[PDB]
Amino acid sequence: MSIFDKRVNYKPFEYPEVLQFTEAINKAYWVHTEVDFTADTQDFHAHLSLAEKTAVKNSLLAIAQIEVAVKSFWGNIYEHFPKPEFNGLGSTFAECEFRHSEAYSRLLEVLGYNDEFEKLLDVPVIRRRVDYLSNVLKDTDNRKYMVSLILFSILIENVSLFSQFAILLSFTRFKGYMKNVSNIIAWISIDEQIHANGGIYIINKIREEFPDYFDEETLALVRETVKDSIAVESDILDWIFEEGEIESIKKGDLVNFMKFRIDESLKQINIPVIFDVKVEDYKALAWFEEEVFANSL
Amino acid sequence: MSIFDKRVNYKPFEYPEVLQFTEAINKAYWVHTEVDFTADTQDFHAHLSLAEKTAVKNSLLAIAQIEVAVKSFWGNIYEHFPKPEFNGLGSTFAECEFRHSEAYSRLLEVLGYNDEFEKLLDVPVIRRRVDYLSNVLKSLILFSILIENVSLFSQFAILLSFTRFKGYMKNVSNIIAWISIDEQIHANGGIYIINKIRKDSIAVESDILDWIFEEGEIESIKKGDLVNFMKFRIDESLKQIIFDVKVEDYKALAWFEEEVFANSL
Ligand SMILES: [Mg+2]
Ligand SMILES: [Mn+2]
Ligand SMILES: [Mn+2]
Ligand SMILES: [Mn+2]
Ligand SMILES: [Mn+2]
């Protein structure tokens, strides 16, 4: 049988590597109620400029536009991979997403941005992403579902949030502010890396069992659709920094950071690199990995 | 706009009490990898009789028949109650059921009963409950009293009895106590949706009790008290939403709520 065929017996697991992703979530388990944002409200109110206040506010709004919602992809991966492993993997990932949405919802409530979130569809750059995301995940056919799994793992889990993650973390590393928010973002970015790595694993298993599925047309659509994401997210970075340039982080460094992460995801699934970022370009955000590790414990 | 209509916006929560059950699950979070069953294997092999081994074996097998499987009920409650709270409640309970199925799978492996679980459908007593739960559940009312309660709680008491009276299987009792706390939250979560809405099971479960003690009854627990303890938990859950038990009939199994807390921490 294949990965798309239903197996009734619980164990032995046909894909026991699922446990490596679920155990990783279990070991990193966290809830936002372990975090109090009182000190972050005071640094935000007193020690942040308007350009920095807008950078944090539009960052969290852009993340919550995708994350604060009913995300049903992972919770329903058993419908396409009818294995007891992937039901456990999806349930573990779906519960993680509910913890994330509650963490983002609390951030918007504590900082007083619930009103802007309900009217976030009044921003043009947001609807352009909603329209873009409303063409990259429309097959949420096993082969049109797998390319949707590709575009879900490279975007929703790996690069459509991480540029905003780095903006929030930059205030803690370079300014020492927003340390509790950076605590939550660090824990989330670890969960999101486990989600993306789990998607890469499933994609490679489909390639290990169905190598014909990765034909020339599918690779051409993935690389084309990925190139459109950066044109969309570069305009979002413009809207995030709409009140001006800030000292903690630069937009040009975020774009190369976004390009580097995409190529790293394409490498792990044997898809040709698109941008080939230079060392002197992506090392500007090389601090992101160690900053996630610092704000983790 | 009722509970079966899809409210698109995430917050505010129409049913904010959902967070009471998810946080209780979050606070009681646990995995079977925290527990080592080496001390339980030595007591099982040396200090338990054949009737006690069979009681523990068939207890675990009876629980595993329902819990070691793909349980798509809670994971799909958003398709019937399209609210962001219930998708969060369903996902929280669904993940918890995977931690349970993995814990039971480890118990079957640690006690060496994997081949017995493969051939569990050879048991005519197991086939009767499979066919009973088949036409039934063809739902939430039945699901929260059956799967989420005393279709497991009687077998939970059989396992916990060895620790209270004989001091054995303390690590298994750790797993079973944590599971019973999670199951109690799952039942209260189903009852919540049920009062926000607002006989055949006992004969089948008594046959399973006959099969659990097929090699003879044991010292730590008796079948007759289990049926009354079963009869208590059924009506006491019906009060929240038929087998009136006298209290000196059921308080023979009232240490359960006490032994669960002693093995929780
Ligand atoms: Mg589902
Ligand atoms: Mn999420
Ligand atoms: Mn995710
Ligand atoms: Mn369960
Ligand atoms: Mn349950």
CATH (domain of B64): 1.10.620.20
Interchain pair B78, A72: CB under 8 A? yes
State how far the alpha carbon of B4 is from the alpha carbons of A186, B1, B76, B81, in Å.
36, 8, 13, 5
Closest chain A residue to B84 measured between Cα atoms? Answer: A70
Residue B136 belongs to some domain of the structure? yes
Structural domains in chain A (count): 1
Q: What is the CA radius of gyration of chain A?
A: 19
Residue A200: name the closest of A135, A162, A151 by CA: A151
Residue B183 belongs to some domain of the structure? yes
Of B68, B78, B92, the CB nearest to A10: B68
- Chain A residues whose CB is inside 8 A of the B70 CB are 10, 78, 84, 87
Interchain pair A95, B97: CB under 8 A? no
Q: Which two tokens stand for residue A212?
A: 């014909």
Residue A210 belongs to some domain of the structure? yes
User: Residue B32, annotated ligand binder?
Assistant: no
Q: Which two tokens stand for residue A44?
A: 């935000």
Interchain pair A33, B23: CB under 8 A? yes
Q: What is the CA angle A185-A188-A194, rounded to 5?
A: 145
Cα of B214 vs centre of ligand 4, distance in Å, is 26
Burial class (CB within 10 angstroms; exposed 0-12, middle 13-18, buried 19+) of B77? buried
CB B131 within 8 A of CB B121: no
Q: Which amino acid is it at B22?
A: T
- Chain A residues whose CB is inside 8 A of the B95 CB are 91-92, 94-95
Measured between alpha carbons, how far apart are the two ends of chain A, in Å? 43
CB B9 within 8 A of CB B80: no
What distance in Å separates the CA atoms of residue B208 and residue A271, rounded to the nearest whole number?
55
Closest chain A residue to B27 measured between Cα atoms? Answer: A31
State how far the alpha carbon of B196 is from the alpha carbons of B80, B150, B189, B235, in Å.
14, 22, 11, 19
CB A166 within 8 A of CB A249: yes
Q: B190: how many CB neighbours lie within 10 A of its CB?
A: 26
Our CA-based measurement puts residue A222 at a distance from the nearest CA of chain B, in whole angstroms, of 30
Interchain contact B113–A (C-beta under 8 A) = no
Burial class (CB within 10 angstroms; exposed 0-12, middle 13-18, buried 19+) of A135? exposed
Q: Which two tokens stand for residue A2?
A: 């294949």
Domain containing B87: what range? 17-264
- Chain B residues whose CB is inside 8 A of the A29 CB are 29
Q: Which two tokens stand for residue A39?
A: 């000190």
Residue B4 belongs to some domain of the structure? no
* Dihedral angle, C-alpha A144, A145, A150, A156, nearest 10 °: 120
**Is the link from the previous residue into A12 a cis peptide, with omega within 30 of 0?**
yes
Interchain contact A63–B (C-beta under 8 A) = no
CB A91 within 8 A of CB B102: no
Our CA-based measurement puts residue B84 at a distance from the nearest CA of chain A, in whole angstroms, of 6
- Chain A residues whose CB is inside 8 A of the B102 CB are 88
Residue B10 belongs to some domain of the structure? no
- Chain A residues whose CB is inside 8 A of the B61 CB are none
What distance in Å separates the CA atoms of residue A63 and residue A108, rounded to the nearest whole number?
11
Interchain contact B240–A (C-beta under 8 A) = no
Q: A270: how many CB neighbours lie within 10 A of its CB?
A: 11
Residue B174 belongs to some domain of the structure? yes
Q: Which two tokens stand for residue A192?
A: 């999101």
CB B161 within 8 A of CB B169: no
Of B22, B98, B118, the CB nearest to A92: B98
Our CA-based measurement puts residue B245 at a distance from the nearest CA of chain A, in whole angstroms, of 38
What distance in Å separates the CA atoms of residue B237 and residue B187, rounded to the nearest whole number?
9
Burial class (CB within 10 angstroms; exposed 0-12, middle 13-18, buried 19+) of A46? exposed
CB A123 within 8 A of CB A240: no
Closest chain B residue to A30 measured between Cα atoms? Answer: B26
Sign, Cα dihedral of B34, B40, B41, B44:
negative
What distance in Å separates the CA atoms of residue A220 and residue B243, rounded to the nearest whole number?
67
Our CA-based measurement puts residue A95 at a distance from the nearest CA of chain B, in whole angstroms, of 5
* Dihedral angle, C-alpha A123, A125, A129, A130, nearest 10 °: 20
Of A23, A92, A105, the CB nearest to B10: A105
Residue B153: name the closest of B243, B227, B45 by CA: B227
What distance in Å separates the CA atoms of residue A226 and residue A258, rounded to the nearest whole number?
11
**Orientation angle between helical segments A179-209 and A38-47, nearest 10 degrees:** 110
Our CA-based measurement puts residue A166 at a distance from the nearest CA of chain B, in whole angstroms, of 25
Q: Which ligand places an atom closest to the C-alpha of B99?
A: 4
What distance in Å separates the CA atoms of residue B152 and residue B80, rounded to the nearest whole number?
26
Residue B103: name the closest of B47, B161, B171, B185 by CA: B171
Q: Which two tokens stand for residue B173?
A: 């009792």
Our CA-based measurement puts residue B118 at a distance from the nearest CA of chain A, in whole angstroms, of 8
Interchain pair A87, B95: CB under 8 A? no
What distance in Å separates the CA atoms of residue A185 and residue A180, rounded to the nearest whole number?
9
Sign, Cα dihedral of A139, A209, B95, B140:
positive
Cα of B120 vs centre of ligand 1, distance in Å, is 28
Interchain contact B66–A (C-beta under 8 A) = no
Q: B226: how many CB neighbours lie within 10 A of its CB?
A: 24
Residue A96: name the closest of A31, A11, A33 by CA: A31
**Is the link from the previous residue into B12 a cis peptide, with omega within 30 of 0?**
yes
Per the rule left: phi > 0, alpha: psi between -120 and 50, beta: everything else, A178 is left
Q: Look at residue A237 and give its three-state secondary structure.
A: helix
Interchain contact B91–A (C-beta under 8 A) = yes
Q: A123: how many CB neighbours lie within 10 A of its CB?
A: 18
Residue A258 belongs to some domain of the structure? yes
User: Residue A45, annotated ligand binder?
Assistant: no
**Size of chain B, expressed as the number of residues it contains:** 265
Our CA-based measurement puts residue A34 at a distance from the nearest CA of chain B, in whole angstroms, of 11
State how far the alpha carbon of A232 is from the alpha carbons of A69, A155, B225, in Å.
20, 12, 67
Residue A230: name the closest of A124, A126, A159, A278 by CA: A159
- Three-state SS string across chain B, please? CCCCCCCCCCCCCCCCCHHHHHHHHHHCCCCHHHCCCHHHHHHHHHHCCHHHHHHHHHHHHHHHHHHCCCCCCHHHHHHCCCCHHHHHHHHHHHHHHHHHHHHHHHHHHHCCCHHHHHCHHHCHHHHHHHHHHHHCCCCHHHHHHHHHHHCCHHHHHHHHHHHHHHCCCHHHHHHHHHHHHHHHHHHHHHHHHHHHHCCHHHHHHHHHHHHHCCCCCCCCCCHHHHHHHHHHHHHHHHHCCCCCCCHHHHHHHCHHHHHHHHHHC
- Chain A residues whose CB is inside 8 A of the B28 CB are none
Half-sphere exposure of residue A274: CA atoms within 13 angstroms, side-chain side: 23
Q: How was this structure determined?
A: X-ray
Cα of A10 vs centre of ligand 2, distance in Å, is 27
Given in angstroms, what resolution was this structure solved at? Answer: 2.1
Q: Which two tokens stand for residue A297?
A: 């414990």
Cα of A194 vs centre of ligand 3, distance in Å, is 8
Residue B1 belongs to some domain of the structure? no
What distance in Å separates the CA atoms of residue A15 and residue B112, rounded to the nearest whole number?
22
- Chain A residues whose CB is inside 8 A of the B87 CB are 70, 72, 75, 98
What distance in Å separates the CA atoms of residue A22 and residue A90, rounded to the nearest whole number?
9
Interchain pair A98, B78: CB under 8 A? no
Strands (E), A82-193: none
Interchain contact A293–B (C-beta under 8 A) = no
**Size of chain A, expressed as the number of residues it contains:** 297
